Design a protein around this motif. Sequence first.
Motif, PDB file in Angstrom:
ATOM      1  N   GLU A   1       4.514  -0.742  -5.042  1.00  0.00           N
ATOM      2  CA  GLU A   1       3.666  -1.801  -5.578  1.00  0.00           C
ATOM      3  C   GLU A   1       4.502  -3.050  -5.496  1.00  0.00           C
TER       4      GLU A   1
ATOM      5  N   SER B   1       3.874   5.631  -4.812  1.00  0.00           N
ATOM      6  CA  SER B   1       3.285   4.497  -4.135  1.00  0.00           C
ATOM      7  C   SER B   1       4.130   3.276  -4.459  1.00  0.00           C
TER       8      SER B   1
ATOM      9  N   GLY C   1       0.761  -1.242   0.000  1.00  0.00           N
ATOM     10  CA  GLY C   1       0.000   0.000   0.000  1.00  0.00           C
ATOM     11  C   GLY C   1       0.804   1.311   0.000  1.00  0.00           C
TER      12      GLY C   1
END
Lengths: 339, 340, 335, 339, 340, 335
Positions: free
Chosen positions: E329, E327, E308
């Motif tokens: 991944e 972000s 997350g």
Amino acid sequence: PTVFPAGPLFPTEGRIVQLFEKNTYSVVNIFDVTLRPQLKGNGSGVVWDGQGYIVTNYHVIGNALSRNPSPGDVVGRVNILASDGVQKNFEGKLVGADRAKDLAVLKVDAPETLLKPIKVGQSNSLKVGQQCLAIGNPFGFDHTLTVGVISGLNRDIFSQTGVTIGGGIQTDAAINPGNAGGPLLDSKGNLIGINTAIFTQTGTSAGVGFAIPSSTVLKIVPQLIQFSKVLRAGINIELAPDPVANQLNVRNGALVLQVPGKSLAEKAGLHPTSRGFAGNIVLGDIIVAVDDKPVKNKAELMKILDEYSVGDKVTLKIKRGNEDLELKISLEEKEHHHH
Amino acid sequence: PTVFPAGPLFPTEGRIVQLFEKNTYSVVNIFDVTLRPGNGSGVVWDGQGYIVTNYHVIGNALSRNPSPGDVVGRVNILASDGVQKNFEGKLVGADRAKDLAVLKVDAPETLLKPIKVGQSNSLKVGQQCLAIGNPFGFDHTLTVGVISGLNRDIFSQTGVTIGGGIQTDAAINPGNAGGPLLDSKGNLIGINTAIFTQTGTSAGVGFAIPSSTVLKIVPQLIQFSKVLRAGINIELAPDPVANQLNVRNGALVLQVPGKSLAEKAGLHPTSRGFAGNIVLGDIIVAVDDKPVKNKAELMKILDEYSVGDKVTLKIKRGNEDLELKISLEEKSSLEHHHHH
Amino acid sequence: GPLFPTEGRIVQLFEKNTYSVVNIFDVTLRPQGNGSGVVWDGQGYIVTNYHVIGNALSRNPSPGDVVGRVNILASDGVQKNFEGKLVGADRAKDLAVLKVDAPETLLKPIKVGQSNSLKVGQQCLAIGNPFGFDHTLTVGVISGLNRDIFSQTGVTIGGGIQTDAAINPGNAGGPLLDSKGNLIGINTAIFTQTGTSAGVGFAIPSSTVLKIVPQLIQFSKVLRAGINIELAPDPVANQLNVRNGALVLQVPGKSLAEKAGLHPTSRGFAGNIVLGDIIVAVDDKPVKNKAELMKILDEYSVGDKVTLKIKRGNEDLELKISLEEKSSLEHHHHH
Amino acid sequence: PTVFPAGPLFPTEGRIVQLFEKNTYSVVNIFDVTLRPQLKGNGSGVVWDGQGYIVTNYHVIGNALSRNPSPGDVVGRVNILASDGVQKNFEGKLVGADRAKDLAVLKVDAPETLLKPIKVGQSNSLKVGQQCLAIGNPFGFDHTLTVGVISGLNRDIFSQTGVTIGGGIQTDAAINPGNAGGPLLDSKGNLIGINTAIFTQTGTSAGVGFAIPSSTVLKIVPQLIQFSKVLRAGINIELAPDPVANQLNVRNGALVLQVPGKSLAEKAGLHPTSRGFAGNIVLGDIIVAVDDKPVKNKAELMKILDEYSVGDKVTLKIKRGNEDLELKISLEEKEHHHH
Amino acid sequence: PTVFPAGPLFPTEGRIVQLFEKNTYSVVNIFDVTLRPGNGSGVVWDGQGYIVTNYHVIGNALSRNPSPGDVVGRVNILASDGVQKNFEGKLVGADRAKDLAVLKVDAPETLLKPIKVGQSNSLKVGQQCLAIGNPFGFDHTLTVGVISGLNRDIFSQTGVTIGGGIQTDAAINPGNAGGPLLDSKGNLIGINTAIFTQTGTSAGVGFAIPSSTVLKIVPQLIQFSKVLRAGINIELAPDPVANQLNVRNGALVLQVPGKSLAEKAGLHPTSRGFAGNIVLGDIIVAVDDKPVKNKAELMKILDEYSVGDKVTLKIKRGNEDLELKISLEEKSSLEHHHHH
Amino acid sequence: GPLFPTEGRIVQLFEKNTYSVVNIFDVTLRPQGNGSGVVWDGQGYIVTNYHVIGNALSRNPSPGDVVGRVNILASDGVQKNFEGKLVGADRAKDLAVLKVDAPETLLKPIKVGQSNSLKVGQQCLAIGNPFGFDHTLTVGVISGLNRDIFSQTGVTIGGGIQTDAAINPGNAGGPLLDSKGNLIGINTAIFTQTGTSAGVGFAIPSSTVLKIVPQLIQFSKVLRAGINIELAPDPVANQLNVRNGALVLQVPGKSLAEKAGLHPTSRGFAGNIVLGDIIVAVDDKPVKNKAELMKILDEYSVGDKVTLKIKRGNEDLELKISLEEKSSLEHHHHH
């Protein structure tokens, strides 16, 4: 001791002598200017037209193209043989390049008088057994010749680019650094391919070499001239070479070998081949038709896709086991060998 | 630019093109069923589905001791419609010594175009030859050169050297191994045969088993599944070695295995002394009456005798001419070169 | 069998010429070097590569020493064995001459052609007699002219013929013939830098053989006068945009060349290349490349005074220098 | 700039320095006289006793032994270091040789004063981890040393003879042309083996080398001295190396890999291993005992047989599948590797 | 001559001998069941029969997509009676990125002697190390040297380079691959790992995965059968390359795959211009707050975040200090060296 | 963790010496040569192999040119980057000297030992700083003394130290230390004839470094006077039973050596070997082998007149000869 003078030549060798002489002018020498020589890449090219456009392998100026040049950048030194019998040196500015087909185009600023365009033949009508002549101008002070026959057609070229080229001509004329980038000519002196250097899997020579067919050159060069590049649309999957496909008993279509993570291929429903813990082999889908423009091998598939544009949506006709299924997929922008 | 269409072919390239196309049908593709991703080409021997190839192209299958009748190959044959059709290849027989194997395919006689076979004994160095392959079952390959040499040892990838071979400067490679070598009339004059050289280095020549050998071996494999040979278990010098030692006629005996028929008969081998003074092993110049020029000829001559037979060998032992008699027994030993 | 025209002509040319191609075994080699040679004349002079008797030659034989066993094909189809006595050798051109004591009837001298009028594209036949029991043939075209030969002697020979006929131990020392069966060169074994075959081979041109062989017969060797300098091979020179003349690369300390006032080629630290003098004239005789300069100086003798016309950058200068025996043969280091 | 003098050494290196110095005299240099050098084989040996007997590898005089010499024939030049610090040159006459164990014995005519016999240890009690020192005298003007540990025991030596030797010591001291034929010593300076040159399968070094254990040297040398050769009795079959046997799950006994045509083994009832057309593997007999002198691997079997004489009749206890069978066979006179 | 019996061992060789003998029991032999005549050694991880080895020693079996529970190995374990006993090795999990695999054996806890594991983070170059193997299941091997280097890339025969490795001058070879590297106290400090170099040429040093990595990866494989990694799909320069480019702190971004999270976030890669004037790709010096010394450290830091997570990267773009957010991944991409 | 005595001593010796081992990147090399060096003194002089900056050196840099980037480990555990300006280089001994402009506090000069008192069997530590971000160590023993080093410069260095510590790109240019942490040589990368590793490596002995480095600092190079002759390497000589002196193998045409009257070594065709003169004395100074002769002549200068005492077969002869600059460096041709 008595020395016998050059006498008349026999018909066949006579014709080769004449063909070679006449075509020398159309075969140029190219030095990759990014290479500091040993002062204690490179090869041949062909005069494409009267404008000064020069056709060679991507690889002969590989080191220079590895430096991300833009069109106009002086990327080669070009030596052109004049009627005077002496080779004249010109700036080779980059026009465009395509690694997938190992083709590059240069432009020279030269007197049209000086330039003698190669005659182009049709590679699609070539027959195994036909005589071919591979000409080089590797150093810009002379020319070279090797002679053999068309040995095979529609074979993979394992280019020293690292990328394998489909649809290649095989010849048993010696293809080497002395003629890489130069023309392969048929018995009439027409260009039927571009002598292309390769890497073999093993170290042993099979006594045969390869040329990018003129059909491909004709298709690529104008694109390089107009756009400096070829944009391709396709499917990011790995397909089996004809030899592997046929050995696994796939006589028709493009056998899918691999379909990588979360790919467009994944999401459309395409399966790869594999070995099970048994040692069993599990065949992947076989693409038999795009829309329904029939597919019969990897190479023809590539040539189908290479003409669509990005985002085009097509319908793959596939074979899995005995069934026959249609599959949707959208194409995105479009790999090497271990040699 | 402007595109020029297929022109008329000149006479020599023209003939080659037609001979090739004509002969594609007789040149099949063979995949060894025991392999995964050997393999190569073969020749349709007759209208009954007999297929001839190298022992080596199905070498892996043959190593697993298959029996005649076992499916050891997938055979691809070019039909008139231009597509290759697939057939099970059942083993008929194999002969490692001559690197030949025979398979049997179950096909419509209308499909099978038997290769035309010529006489390799009449071959002349300088003659044009074509080596054809069908290595993957989807097309055909061609190489072209001349007959470069005759009666040369073939260092077969079987590991066993074959005498009496044809040398050509047509490229012989995995793309035509097991396939036919043809003369300018399109007659089979040999089978293209993969080799190992001592160096990593190409001499630029290749080899084929002569059709005279193929003509002799194939019918035996079809009839018997193997070749029975009468002979003498001894080591004979290769021709290049014998000539280097100034033995210009006959077969020179190098090594004689301990307590063999040869030993008991009194055949002497060849030894380099510690000083360096060579006594030449015996040199075999005649079997019974018939003269022996070299090693290849001795083998050829012996191959026509039977296991029972007692023969008289006329031998050169240094300066003197002498005679030793010997019974022939099954010639089992194989001549291993150790090239890789 | 009946044969087609071209193959018919090769078959007959080959057969006719087998007699002139002999087998040579170097007598200093124990069994388990060696190759072919050509009958040069009816007195029994045999021409071959220095390298085919290289082992014997390494042992400093004098003229008259038995350095080889020679096998010669007689009219009756069998080869006859003869002592091959050393006549002369020249490592620089990879040539050697032997003499056999044989009857004229046995000897069929090769016919010699004119290598200076060769054209790329011409048919050539490379013939061998590697073992004294048969002959071999390879067939190709003339593939290139005036190319460096990286001889297995270790020395580079300039002015060589390149062919795509296979040149191998089976024909090294043997003749390269044209379509008239005239000698145009001597098949010469090489070492390549890599080892990767380029599908082409080499022959010393008959013009060189013609020049060297009579001197070996008279004198047993060739003495050369020259300049102790390192010259650019043609590829390297034409990479540096020198299309005419011999580009001088290296120039020894306190050399005759230094004393004379001749500049080497230098890469400066600031990334740049600056060109050594280019020799374009020896006694106003045009010099076209390295091989030509070598040919030219070979006609002089030790001590002779010559005038060099050089190109220093964009200048034109004339130097004096005295020719001396040379400190080396030109060793490539291919294997 | 200040230069610090040689000071006292630390305990371990100090002991090695002393061991090396003291044993140099016992390590001789051997030149194979049949080799014409390059005037524009060979290695080290060990002084076996005060009589002038010298022990080396068969291989260091391999070329000479390839010429079928008889005992007494001068086959080597031997350089022996004297107290004077200078090496003195002697004629090495052949005493005997054994290719199977890559051992050869020479005899020198030298003053007992000059000769300093090596001290011999017991290789049978060696422990992996023990320090070892490999000493050489490769050129007869100095000595060499490498140091490591016993890395493994009872391992095959793929000798440059071409014949593999069972029961070898493995060490991670560098074994090379600089010490081949010389001694491997333990931490007390006792000879525990003879540094033996090998060929590997691949080209890459595994960082370990090998020595013929002293147990073997002790067993062979006297035989060579008395008889100039070792006559062996055995069975002309091919047995699986421990690594192959164990991989096939044969943990105990000598696995029969091959039994050639019409052999004594054939006629007695011994079966080899093979692959069936399935790809199935068929295990051969496993020799577990001669008479019933237990066998546990190839190497120990060889050592059992090597002591019988020709014609001796013995009783092989074998395993085939789960059964257990006794087999008669008579022994006859007694192979290489692909490296 | 006279034979001298086993004397007393000196202190250092004495310790080595006892450590080796003591640890033989914990070093097992693993044969990949999918191979015929991979393979090597492993380490008894705990009393439950968990076995730790290289991914590569069972590489062939792992390539065939086996499931947890499948028998992929035959495991040989040395018992107190001095004979090796055989067990089925069932696959627990494998992690290609760190070249580690875990098998599970069903054995009497009385048989299993778990290896003792130490702290690789405290290791000092110069420390003594022992590399133990049990390559064929009938004995054990030893090599000995020092810790030669720390935090070095391991060019694993997996094809995937492992960062943070230990370099030793103990010989690392097929005879000890998958086996333990021990310190002088006999604690496991790494797993001996087979590599490919770019040349055919030995630098005379070998490599092991540090126990700190093994300690982190193994429990995840036991619990989950695989390792889930959060990360950024980009190409980072190996330390030797970065330093050669005068990037002495941080991780240098070489390549940024088209239309990736990295690209959309605005991370710039590294390009050699046609003149030759290098703009350095961005250099990552901090993740959020925590400083990043090099590539290995960035990876280590990221491996503790979750899929997350949004992080802030402090980057050096030429001279200026800037911030880009991204972000994380699933870090799927593998770092392929192409040595053979 | 707590450590045992010997490993404890290595760990501390290594740590203490890291500071004196620098990293050098050759500035003429673009990324994707290079290695380690040693701090010679507090003025910032850095010693390394010629080969670690070989590419830069090939471009004829002058003293003062920036040929390298040097990274030096500071007391705070991070390496600092400095311009490495060329001071001097000597290809013959594969040594080069750079100078950095750094604060004394940063610089910890290596301590130098006495290579002439080394004993086979002694512990040695080979230390590297290959990339400027850490240091490497290999440990072995002195394995041999006075051995030829086949340097990757292409030139053979006599008198080298052989060790079974691994010598590799990770420590080339770095120090070889003894158990006291004294410099006993400079780790030197080599090419072997085959490529097959013998498990041993080499270092230029500190006695040579001591001799060469001050001359490079003063003069930027070392000029040598000698004899243009080919001498037998020790193995080859001791194969021919020459246990003392420098065996003369080859002797050039019209050389000073020829004029002086000195004989080469000759293999006659009759299978035999005849020995070239053996040089055993230069000005009655005993000559023990090739390396010793080289050491001895290096102390003279161009033009100096010396007396050679040779052994011609079983004779004893004294020749005169004048020393000249030499025509070559000694190139092995290993790769």
